[PDB]
Ligand binder design. Structure first.
Ligand SMILES: Nc1ncnc2[nH]cnc12
Ligand SMILES: [Zn+2]
Length: 335
């Protein structure tokens, strides 16, 4: 038996969702920004969410303290540091370029800020990293295409493209052009689907957008033969247990489909999504899965190895990490 988390890769994580209330107040201070909260207690008080939207509102509001390159670097390093301590061996990190350019902050600023933290991640924290630019699905495709163009032109260190923000009423198909652009640019593809959006949206992301893994995807359980294709094709599903609970997509953690999804062969893995908003990082997600859903060591290991096989890391990086989960299991079961 073990109480430690396994060596994993986090494939579903928003860097802006990594922003802890302490850092928010610190960056506000450094930028001489007045916050709409008397104290940091009044802030934490605002973390009871009702749906995806109520969360996004805070999520976007908090980004206001991110002004300088240093701000982005600091935020990224604070996550890489905490992620490492929690067992994260490889991190594929999302970022919402538009959520900053819409505030007058240059692409140069937000991209450089993060990248500079990432370019040194293996050395400083022992974490392999990929940068994924995610696009706000509730803004136009045309503006997403223009931002993509600028990322390309400036040679931004992005490995792939993502799709998030308010899902319902904003189908994957809306960004077909965008993803055709990305693919011909050699960019890898992921997209949020099946969080609050229907199983239909998953098929759309797979067929119209040609994504390489589905983010969330829990609503796939509503359609037998969508579930069927997922299983058949081993499409990676980046599940976020605590996220789904705190956003009310799932009532209680005890009600989460993850166990069933694993049992039926869906290629699922565990992610913290927006760690500073849902009260826990990946290792916290694991802890709760064990504590509440009685996940075994071998089960946890399976989840870990999925996350590695599903990553866009080198086969070499996967191999050594895979061997690591094998060691963890052997060290972690009762004699
Ligand atoms: N989990 C999530 N779903 C949709 N949009 C998001 N933006 C940040 N995190 C998100
Ligand atoms: Zn997400």
């Amino acid at each position: 038996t073990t109480s430690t988390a396994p060596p994993v890769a986090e494939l579903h994580l928003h860097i802006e969702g990594t922003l802890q209330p302490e850092l928010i107040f610190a960056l506000a201070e450094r930028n001489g920004i007045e916050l709409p909260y008397e104290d940091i207690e009044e802030l934490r008080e605002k973390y009871e969410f009702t749906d995806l939207q109520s969360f996004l509102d805070l999520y976007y509001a908090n980004m206001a303290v991110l002004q300088t390159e240093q701000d982005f670097t600091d935020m990224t390093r604070a996550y890489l540091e905490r992620a490492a301590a929690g067992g994260v061996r490889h991190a594929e990190i999302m970022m919402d370029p538009q959520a900053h350019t819409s505030r007058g902050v240059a692409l140069e600023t937000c991209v450089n800020g993060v990248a500079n933290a990432l370019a040194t991640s293996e050395e400083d924290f022992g974490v392999s990293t990929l940068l994924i630019a995610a696009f706000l699905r509730d803004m136009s495709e045309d503006s997403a295409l223009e931002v993509l163009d600028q990322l390309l032109a400036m040679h931004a260190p992005i490995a792939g493209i993502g799709l998030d923000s308010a899902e319902v009423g904003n189908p994957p198909s809306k960004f077909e052009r965008l993803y055709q652009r990305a693919a011909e640019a050699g960019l890898r593809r992921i997209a949020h689907a099946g969080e609050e959006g229907p199983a239909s949206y998953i098929t759309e992301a797979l067929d119209v957008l040609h994504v390489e893994r589905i983010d969330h995807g829990i609503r796939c359980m509503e359609d037998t033969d969508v579930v069927q294709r997922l299983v058949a094709e081993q499409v990676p599903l980046t599940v976020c247990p605590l996220s789904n609970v705190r956003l009310r997509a799932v009532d209680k953690l005890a009600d989460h489909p993850l166990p069933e999804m694993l049992a039926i062969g869906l290629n699922v893995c565990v992610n913290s999504d927006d760690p500073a908003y849902f009260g826990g990082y990946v290792d916290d997600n694991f802890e709760q899965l064990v504590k509440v859903l009685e996940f075994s060591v071998p089960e946890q290991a399976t989840l870990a190895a999925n996350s590695i096989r599903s990553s866009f890391a080198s086969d070499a990086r996967k191999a050594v990490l895979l061997d690591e989960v094998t060691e963890w299991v052997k060290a972690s079961v009762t004699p």
